[PDB]
């Protein structure tokens, strides 16, 4: 299946995923397509933070869903 990831700059990325994929693999694909390291990535779905251990199916992410990619702050 395909999903979309909206970046802070507003850019929309397309990712090929499976509902069994973990959030870590999604961040790995995002790094492959953009270079943003997985340590800095924070994935949001409808305003909730997604954790690395759980899968797309755990968060009820169906086809063509749109996640948002934000970055960790370094304060």
């Amino acid at each position: 299946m395909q999903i979309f990831v909206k970046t802070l700059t507003g850019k929309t990325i397309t990712l090929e995923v499976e509902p069994s994929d973990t959030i870590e693999n999604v961040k790995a694909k995002i790094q492959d397509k953009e270079g943003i390291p997985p340590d800095q990535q924070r994935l949001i779905f409808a305003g909730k933070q997604l954790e690395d251990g759980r899968t797309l199916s755990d968060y009820n992410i169906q086809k063509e869903s749109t996640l948002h990619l934000v970055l960790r702050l370094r304060g």
Partner: protein, 309 residues
């Protein structure tokens, strides 16, 4: 000589150590109020003092789990290593709250602590209860070191307030917290979601609680644009988060907020609290103003029970 060993600083275990052999040879990794004593041989001055050791038998493992609610083998070494620094920080009272003077990139921890002192929250691990009580009393070294340890952040490392609060909420009893959302698509209809615990009190994407009550536009998978709005909230607070952006804080409309000045690579946190006026706490520094505009990243609001109309 007689010494005491401990893992929780409450239950003490009498040990007789040979002063001709190091602590390391007798106990494994050993700490005296955060100081690494593994390679030191007992001093006469050590008599009767309490030393932390690692949980190296079942009894200590049980005591540690009951006190800290963790079984990370490295948790206690990380806690002691944090404490060795945090015991040297200063904790001034600023506008009636315990803050932290600037050191070792601790602005995010100072903001976290200030926030915690303004919202109703009860910790589950005895360690956090005890350290938070002392920190509110003004002795926050242990509390800050525990925060660092639980969050797997070393002393000096750049920290994010949002992540820290997420971690701390994981160790708080927020299970009764409940959030009901509705998403309305003119094609697809309505969809309710229920969130419990941490997911019930945290939102990433807007700073405005009011806007979340009124509705935010999000994509529907059908391709249209659906409206997501808050149907019900049961919690003693909410945290609204977004990437830092210029935002006006108005007296009386929020509890407290975090300000981040800088960029994704480098930056600084300040705390804003809404009291009789708006106070900006920057470590030891305190200023006031009747209005506030700045690069806000997190806003906290009081809550009890909300039901949409």
């Amino acid at each position: 000589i007689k010494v005491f060993t401990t893992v929780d600083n409450i239950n003490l275990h009498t040990q007789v150590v040979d002063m001709s052999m190091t602590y390391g040879q007798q106990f494994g990794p050993t700490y005296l109020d955060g100081a690494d004593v593994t390679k030191i041989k007992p001093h006469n001055s050590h008599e009767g003092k309490t030393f932390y050791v690692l949980p190296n038998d079942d009894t200590l493992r049980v005591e540690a789990f009951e006190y800290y609610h963790t079984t990370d083998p490295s948790f206690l070494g990380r806690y002691m290593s944090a404490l060795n620094h945090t015991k040297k920080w200063k904790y001034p009272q600023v506008n009636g709250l315990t803050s932290i003077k600037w050191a070792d990139n601790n602005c995010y921890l100072a903001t976290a602590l200030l926030t915690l002192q303004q919202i109703e929250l009860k910790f589950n691990p005895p360690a956090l209860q005890d350290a938070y009580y002392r920190a509110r009393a003004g002795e926050a070294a242990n509390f800050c070191a525990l925060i660092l340890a639980y969050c797997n952040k070393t002393v000096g490392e750049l920290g994010d307030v949002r992540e820290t609060m997420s971690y701390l909420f994981q160790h708080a009893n927020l299970d009764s917290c409940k959030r009901v959302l509705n998403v309305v698509c003119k094609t697809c209809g309505q969809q309710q979601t229920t969130l419990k615990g941490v997911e019930a009190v945290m939102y990433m994407g807007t700073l405005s609680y009011e806007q979340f009550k009124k509705g935010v536009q999000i994509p529907c998978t059908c391709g249209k644009q659906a409206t997501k709005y808050l149907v019900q909230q049961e919690s003693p607070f909410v945290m609204m988060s977004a990437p830092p952006a210029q935002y006006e804080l108005k007296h009386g409309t929020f509890t407290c907020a975090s300000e981040y000045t800088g960029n994704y690579q480098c930056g600084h946190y300040k705390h804003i609290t809404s009291k009789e006026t708006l106070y900006c706490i920057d470590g030891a520094l305190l200023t006031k103003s009747s209005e506030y505009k700045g690069p806000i990243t997190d806003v906290f609001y009081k809550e009890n029970s909300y039901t949409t109309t």
